[PDB]
Symmetry: C4
Subunit: 387 residues, 4 copies
């Protein structure tokens, strides 16, 4: 076992090849499948796993009732091999949590699971399944984290946490974690910024995060930092807005775009110089459809022109959260860090007439060979027998 | 593989971070989950597992009928990874048993499973799944043991067993077991004491057990011994009574507290000098709620003052059995033995209108970083379809 | 990996300690559990497994209909860890078979699975799951084998097969198998003998088999042989008759006891000099109850006196097939071969008003420490929802 | 780990011994079993696995509705150990796909999964679960591949793909793949030929494929090539026609037999000099029955005489697809490549009155010891509760 170097650059990619699809909701109609949301993928040098927050209940059972609710004592972080349905029969228990992150440093798994009351939540850190540290809410207002994989470089793993209002200025901290122990942290000086649910990845020994502004930005905020946590901040400038909801594409801003800026959804983007691969919903007002857009100057440029668009989920189909995950050379045998991404396909409340809310997932990995756009939707027929 | 040293002291702890929650009853509403009770956790140098006594039946099936009953030929000791639901599809078979204990010496698993008739029960000992010894009832009155993990020190594992009345003077024996073979035992000379379901842990090469007096003590009895089985006995002196049922907190006794002393529940406590971490129900009359209390002089002092209280399960929620389990430095990489504990959340009979009785579990580990009190209850909605 | 020596003697035993119980039928009321019969246990140097013949169907499903039937194209030999329920989710596939045997030589598993038509059945031999040999019916009349573990000595494994009438003189062959290849066989010269479903075990480099006479013997025939297949034959002389059905205990015979000699049940016995450990039903006319009897001169003596009787299953409870299995020193660390045995608990047709027939199992291992008699029955409530 | 040599000849075989049967449909009546079709078997140096295309749904659930449909975004390639039912609880995820192939080179698994739209499908290649290459439709008309195992020789694996009409001239390409990377391909110059769903195996360092002519051939086309992709093409000359549908046996042709030549079914054959082992349905008009025929001059001879016929599935029972798979000396310890084959037993639409279509499987391996013909059908009772 050797720790991930994380010192190579991102592999340039021309398109996205489908990597997995679990059909969780379709199968859960009869099978014993967890009610879940906020799934995400993360890989070790040996395997890739799907992490997810259960509602401590199964699909098509009465306990799935009211699962639109975000936080409860019953939610747990669990994981299974990528592409398999999240079942009590194939899932490893990770932590008790209604907000989470996880990543492998090359030696062991780090998991971060947040539970407890809204006014005093505690993040429990585990390394190889052993509790190694905790961090408690510092603003007493829903301590929350990535809902996707943390990022590791040379034995150090990094994550971002938020505490404070979801509709106004909050507090954002970056953490450096070694073998499950917080060895350093810093609060970001980001007046008028809002950071939630960051999708972070390593690139040339540094970390880049693309996050969610739930306050007043329809474009996505970003934060990048080195291992010493010296950071820079900004927003993606492209007029191809990345959040949901958002306005129709137009002239963008390198600051928060106020138009339709309230609320949002977890998302991601990959930076390549001045260019950016943007993953986003197809709808500007709802969580449906998904597409990947290559914008050669979208990181720093404000125009709404782009070069490549690839369909992932049809506009008439439900989508939801999305996030980045990477495959290190230690896993692939490549000389660069390969970008992949996952999409949560949310079914149920509030948009559908069920008693429950749950999601399935799909994932893709970046390649330079031929690819094709299509739609790989959830595919479940609602409502269910339970409703 | 190397045997556990067990020669370091207990890690001082300021609070308890949640470690696991299986949501067994909620999931068993639809999923294939064993009807169980008397669960407990125990760890090896590699993993932690949940042990439990099945009723040889599944939740929401007719064979769960009458499972309030304590003993039968159908009950079996099984185990699964911690935090996972006890299912026939993820559970390892250990032993046929209606009373049990288990622990890992660093090399292999030792399991103790008691089955047979009330008037002649036999404990079957296994080492790495192979029968290595037996011990038969010596008072012909329900031979019974810990219902939690045994304690191991330098290749020797220790447990306590009881035989005799549950409402009067009984007989109590301590055993030293090496590779599944009983190498020494001694009967405790404890007139007017009553010991049942001891929660035992190693500390500085010696064993400390906190147990249940079902006869006439509302405080908990304890027994401590070295590897040669030279022992000391007493009761926790604190006026913060630990058993259930019990009186309201008042002036305690270093002997058995007669007030509300009959009946009881399995519990635990961690000794730190004259101080004690007490886990107990919140109700004085019923098995509901759970809290952790730090009493700096509660081991030897009789007053009812304390310094710290941390909520674990709300008073309006069902609890049940609780027990200690430790994580050795061989597992954690620490220089001390870490204290953890589990709580059984009992649902069904006799307090609820069902045909069945079963439990789920939660567990916590002691830390010196920030923690928070809350309520992590079972969360199941009774009755079930079967009733 | 090293091949089993099999050159030590049987461990003398004073009683039997319960080893496993799967509660298969009770659990199958709701869980996904195979309809099975003819289960048996066999161990490697690492683990013990339960082998069984499925009916290619699950309990409480319409396809369990008519499963009283012995042979069909759907029956398969599968296995799971001992004590676990036989489910499609935890069972390894072994072979297509309606008659079978299996054993581990210390290096790999040997399985023998017989399928095909009654008039031309073929035994398929597999070593490490690879087909290594076949043997076809030589009398064109239901080629059939042990339904329990074969026996291995120094890299050679041995089994017995029968072909011919179930109600008259048939043909019996012994096989020597090395790495899945038949290297030698011999037909037993046994006029007026009848051998079926032998329970064979190694002892001091030679093999002893105790079998079933379905023709005209209420006592059990035996055959013993060395590695060169030089054999001896006879019947257990004890007036404590071992087959079912049988007469009340009286003066026995060293030849086939004709009284109630037709029909029978698979069983076993362990020989110790002139003495014998006899496992048998409690009923003389039906497959219910089970007991272990130590008869110090029962191998060669015809009287009906005995020294020890241990209850296993109550007379008012269903039993069925039973068989021997051993644990070699390579597994136990002992200096002798330990005797164990399993009992099939048959539920359903023909004695019960269901559409199906299936069994669960219990097992015990011989010890010299204290033991106790009891009843560990199937425990299922029939009929089921399907009937 | 060492790569397969693939340089030995096929093991001559006189008959076929049954190897596996999963009883998937029977078990799926109650159990949680995937709706599948197009199953196939492939082995590594360690184990054999069943690959299959799920419909992203379970048997006896509403989402099995309309599963007669060949292609959708929900279909996925998964695998489980041979002989086990394809369940979400025991199946490994491989790829998103409605057409697939897979094989092991001795070091790692190669999987090929085709998904996307009919007019622009993309094959995603994975090596050890990591995406290594893609190939996109070149005729924009349903890119499709083997639906059985690819063939590996000295670290290179080979497959055949088709793109174009199913009822006329199409385009056929052979690929050489090393560690999941396409290193060479060539389009076959085969005017008036039609190739689909090739069953390919290695023999003496070269590859032989027997395929399906869906255009105008009731006999099967073949293509053979060396590692440099230098190929030869033709049709099986035997008057014992191998496709379905087909004419009654008569005088054959070394070119496509036009009579009943339209439509077809995936099949296989093993070449031995001028002779051929032919696997085929028993019915000339429908997918029922299965038999193995040895025709000593059937590869190059046009007569309808043969030497051996072995029954596999009765004519009154449903069959379906069939394919070859081999076991290399690296797995068996033999000095030749052993031929095996599997048969898909299709149940449901369009021939049966259900809402769904699914298959189970059986498999056989070639031996030179005694064998027997019989019928090992699916055995499920339709319709099901869902219909
Ligand atoms: C679990 O066990 C309980 C108690 O045995 C079952 O409830 C009982 O159901 C039986 C059968 O329906 C009832 O027995 C009948 O009693 C009536 C008189 O009320 C008598 O006339 C009949 O001859 C028969 O004996 C019984 O009343 C009833 N007991 C109670 C307390 O309700 C229950 O059905 C079982 N549940 C499952 C899921 O198996
Ligand atoms: C699987 O799919 C089939 C076909 O869609 C389902 O059968 C169909 O069920 C629907 C809903 O009940 C029926 O639609 C209705 O048709 C009537 C006219 O007959 C119309 O007045 C209603 O407005 C409605 O459209 C439809 O008749 C029926 N089709 C057939 C061929 O029976 C079936 O229910 C599905 N099965 C499962 C388990 O989901
Ligand atoms: C901690 C927590 O509750 N986080 C939220 C989250 C949150 O409400 C917003 O980002 C605003 O702050 O949004 C949503 C969402 O679907 O928008 C899911 C989350 N649910 C879970 N993580 N359980
Ligand atoms: C062997 C046995 O039956 N032990 C008991 C136990 C016992 O009744 C008391 O401690 C009094 O002696 O109490 C209880 C109880 O929930 O209070 C559960 C146990 N159930 C099981 N261990 N199966
Ligand atoms: C090959 C086969 O059918 N063997 C039989 C067996 C047999 O009928 C007798 O011993 C008489 O020959 O008896 C019985 C039995 O329950 O008595 C179960 C078996 N069923 C299975 N092995 N499948
Ligand atoms: C890609 C695809 O759809 N291939 C087909 C296939 C095809 O229609 C013919 O060979 C004609 O081209 O036939 C059949 C069939 O059962 O005949 C099943 C396949 N289904 C799946 N592979 N999913
Ligand atoms: C990246 O890290 C690896 C492992 O330490 C090292 O060998 C290599 O020199 C580094 N690459 C660069 C470009 O610095
Ligand atoms: C869901 O919760 C509501 C309480 O708001 C309750 O009324 C309803 O019965 C529940 N539904 C189910 C199916 O349990
Ligand atoms: C505890 O045991 C270890 C291992 O034998 C030994 O090295 C060490 O000295 C002991 N620790 C103390 C504090 O005595
Ligand atoms: C039994 O076999 C073992 C392993 O070969 C050998 O060492 C030993 O000498 C044998 N024991 C006897 C009593 O022959
Ligand atoms: C069982 O088989 C019989 C045929 O003998 C049939 O009549 C009956 O319907 C079947 N029962 C079930 C539940 O399928
Ligand atoms: C086949 O390959 C093996 C491994 O490279 C080689 O040793 C052997 O010579 C080859 N066999 C033949 C018959 O050429
Ligand atoms: Ca079920
Ligand atoms: Ca926003
Ligand atoms: Ca642009
Ligand atoms: Ca008490
Ligand atoms: Ca005090
Ligand atoms: Ca008889
Ligand atoms: Ca006698
Ligand atoms: Ca054709
Ligand atoms: Ca011919």
């Amino acid at each position: 076992s050797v720790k991930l170097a994380g010192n190579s650059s991102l592999c340039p990619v021309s398109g996205w090849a489908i990597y997995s699809k679990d059909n969780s909701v379709r199968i859960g109609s009869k099978g014993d499948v967890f009610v879940i949301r906020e799934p995400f993928i993360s890989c070790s040098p040996l395997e890739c796993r799907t992490f997810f927050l259960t509602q401590g209940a199964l699909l098509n059972d009465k306990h799935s009732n009211g699962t639109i609710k975000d936080r409860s004592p019953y939610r747990t972080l669990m994981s299974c091999p990528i592409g398999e349905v999240p079942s009590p029969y194939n899932s490893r228990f990770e932590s008790v949590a209604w907000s989470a992150s996880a990543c492998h440093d090359g030696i062991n798994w780090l998991t971060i699971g947040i539970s407890g009351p809204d006014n005093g939540a505690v993040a429990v850190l585990k390394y190889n399944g052993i509790i190694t540290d905790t961090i408690k809410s510092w603003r007493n207002n829903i301590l929350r984290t990535q809902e996707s994989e943390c990022a590791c470089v040379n034995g150090s793993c990094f994550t971002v946490m938020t505490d404070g209002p979801s509709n106004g200025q909050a507090s954002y901290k970056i953490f450096r974690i070694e073998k499950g122990k917080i060895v350093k942290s810093v609060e970001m000086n980001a007046p008028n910024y809002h950071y939630e649910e960051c999708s972070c990845y390593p690139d040339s020994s540094e970390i880049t995060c693309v996050c969610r502004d739930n306050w007043h930005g329809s474009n996505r905020p970003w934060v990048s930092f080195n291992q010493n946590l010296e950071y820079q901040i900004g927003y993606i400038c492209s007029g191809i807005f990345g959040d949901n909801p958002r306005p129709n594409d137009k002239t963008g801003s390198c600051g928060p775009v106020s138009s339709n800026g309230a609320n949002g959804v977890k998302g991601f983007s990959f930076k390549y110089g001045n260019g950016v691969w943007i993953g986003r919903t197809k709808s500007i007002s709802s969580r449906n459809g998904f597409e990947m857009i290559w914008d050669p100057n979208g990181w720093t440029g404000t125009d709404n022109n782009f070069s490549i668009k690839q369909d992932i989920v049809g506009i008439n189909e439900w989508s939801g959260y999305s996030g980045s995950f990477v495959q290190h050379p230690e896993l692939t045998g490549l000389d660069c860090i390969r970008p992949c991404f996952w999409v949560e396909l949310i079914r149920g409340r509030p948009k559908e007439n069920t008693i429950w809310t749950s999601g399935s997932s799909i994932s893709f990995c970046g390649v330079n060979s031929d690819t094709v756009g299509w739609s790989w939707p959830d595919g479940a027929e609602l409502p269910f027998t339970i409703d």
